[PDB]
């Protein structure tokens, strides 16, 4: 029993963290085989960060403009190219700790683990969700740029995020491992703001199913709802429109608990209008949206506490 924000074991990812210094800027890079990936803004000074032209800035650099350090040992750069918002630094060694891996761009609502890193040195791990507005509510200080987010399935690390910057609200922006930003955000210092966020309906529903799997059903009711009547309510409360795709994704969970999706929707509709009446669900006073249906299957019992 129990239900917590659980991250993936971080070992396979720790073996790939290095430091990258260019001129006077130090940040973190990702060492896979004989390549090191990092944010391109490593090639910027303070002055440069407003209004940079990376083509022009990068062409003013050689292989030995870049310093990369794996633990104590210096790695020599022998090739460089730019790819969207990242740099790809070819090095003299292939990482002996390179795990099997993949580069995936994740979709809003999906979760991943983040290894927060400073000076190429791993300092903590946490779980979060890619928000609808393409930000993450992480925790980063200066020097965390190039810290990565990932999923582990079996033995294979799926890299989905690299950190680049922080926004005025205090939430975070970055890139997939092709160097393409999540969101309409850019690689420079201007007036940029997170767009308005929404609560992640599919995940709230997943988390309700977990509450039941773990033996709680106080919030259930006798009603049912149509998808469209649920949406009219979802909009009032700043929840995402629920779709048939989302209803199909909830099938296995509906089957394990014997509660129909649309019945759980009426459960939730009622939670939204009436409040939680001073009660908790899986130890929380609010509706939780940072667990996917997958996260619930992984973490919970396959056997319901009936």
């Amino acid at each position: 029993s129990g239900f917590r924000k659980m991250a993936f074991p971080s070992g396979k990812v720790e073996g790939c963290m290095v430091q990258v210094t260019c001129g006077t800027t130090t940040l973190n890079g990702l060492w896979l085989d004989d390549t090191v990936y990092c944010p391109r803004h490593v090639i910027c000074t303070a002055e440069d960060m407003l209004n940079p032209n990376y083509e022009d800035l990068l062409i003013r650099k050689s292989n030995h403009s870049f310093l990369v350090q794996a633990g104590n040992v210096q790695l020599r750069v022998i090739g460089h190219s730019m790819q969207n918002c990242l740099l790809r630094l070819k090095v003299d060694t292939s990482n002996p700790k390179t795990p099997k891996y993949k580069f995936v761009r994740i979709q809003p609502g999906q979760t991943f683990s983040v290894l927060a890193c400073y000076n190429g040195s791993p300092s903590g791990v946490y779980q979060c969700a890619m928000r609808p507005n393409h930000t993450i509510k992480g925790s980063f200080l200066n020097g965390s740029c190039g810290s990565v987010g990932f999923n582990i399935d079996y033995d294979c690390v799926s890299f989905c995020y690299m950190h680049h910057m922080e926004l005025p609200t205090g939430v975070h922006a970055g890139t997939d491992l092709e160097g393409k930003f999540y969101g309409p955000f850019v690689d420079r210092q201007t007036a940029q703001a997170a767009g308005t966020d929404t609560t992640i309906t599919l995940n709230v529903l997943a988390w309700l199913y977990a509450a039941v799997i773990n033996g709680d059903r106080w919030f259930l009711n006798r009603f049912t709802t149509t998808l469209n009547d649920f949406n009219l309510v979802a909009m009032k409360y700043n929840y995402e429109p629920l779709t048939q795709d989302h209803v199909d994704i909830l099938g296995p969970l509906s089957a394990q608990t014997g509660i129909a999706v649309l019945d759980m929707c009426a459960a939730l509709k009622e939670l939204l209008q009436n409040g939680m009446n001073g009660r908790t669900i899986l130890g929380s006073t609010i509706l939780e949206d940072e667990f996917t249906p997958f996260d619930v299957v992984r973490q919970c019992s396959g056997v319901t506490f009936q």
Binding site: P39, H41, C44, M49, F140, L141, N142, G143, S144, C145, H163, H164, M165, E166, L167, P168, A173, F185, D187, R188, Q189, T190, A191, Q192
Partner: peptide
């Protein structure tokens, strides 16, 4: 303003 970290 934003901040590249």
């Amino acid at each position: 303003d934003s901040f590249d970290q």
